[PDB]
């Protein structure tokens, strides 16, 4: 019934609806519309992998590489686990 607005995307959502949006340029979060008379939203990274090292957002199942602190290649995969978690092997 009540709506939340994304003025940057020109979109709107009803209470209880969830959508993805960028955050701080390169991150991604999942937002839910609460409403509460102010178009209030709650947004979370808990289902995403926002890796500061690579300044890239990954979805569950996405893979990427990066280095450790001694020149070794790490293979990373986004697992989520309700904790914005990922796992790398060195």
């Amino acid at each position: 019934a009540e709506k939340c607005f994304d003025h940057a995307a020109g979109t709107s959502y009803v209470v209880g609806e969830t959508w993805e949006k960028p955050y701080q340029g390169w991150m991604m979060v999942d937002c839910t519309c609460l409403g509460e008379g102010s178009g209030r939203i709650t947004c979370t990274s808990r289902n995403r992998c926002n890796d500061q090292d690579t300044r890239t957002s990954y979805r569950i199942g996405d893979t990427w590489s990066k280095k450790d602190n001694r020149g070794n290649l790490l293979q990373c995969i986004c697992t989520g686990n309700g904790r914005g978690e990922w796992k790398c092997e060195r």
Partner: peptide
């Protein structure tokens, strides 16, 4: 040898979208 590296970046925020 090397075990798995576990990393996390978990956060939440709220914001109003009507003034």
């Amino acid at each position: 040898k090397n075990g798995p590296i576990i990393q996390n970046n978990k956060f939440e925020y709220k914001e109003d979208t009507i003034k």
